[PDB]
Design a protein around this nucleic acid. Structure first.
Length: 42
DNA sequence: GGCAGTACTAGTAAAAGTACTTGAGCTTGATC
RNA sequence: AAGCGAGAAGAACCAGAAGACCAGGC
DNA sequence: GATCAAGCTCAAGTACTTAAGCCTGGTCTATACTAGTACTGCC
């Protein structure tokens, strides 16, 4: 076995069994301009 | 020594995941 | 260099469970 | 032009396969009813 992310043997198992529903599927969204710099637009 | 009675041997009796199939609802066309 | 009695072989001659369950080390 | 029937697609439900390695000891192993099978007293 801030936020919770699947890691270790479970995560490796999901990666190699190419599961459809990951236990903790997430998105690393990256901002472009001012939204990226300031926090109000973000 | 034969008949019937009886005990023994036998012989039969508090898993999880993925894939496939079926049913229902949509999509399209044909007919009156 | 030593040197003071004799020998030779008849017959024939290893063993399986397997299965289940439990405990235990790593 | 509208309705009905047929075909196609999607979602849900049910069934089938895998669960680390090797290594050491121990104990335990079908009733149950049955017909025949012989013995053995009883007469």
């Amino acid at each position: 076995n801030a936020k919770n992310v699947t890691l270790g043997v479970p995560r490796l198992k999901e990666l190699i069994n190419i599961s459809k529903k990951p236990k903790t599927p997430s998105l690393t969204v990256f901002l472009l301009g001012q939204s990226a710099r300031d926090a109000e637009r973000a």
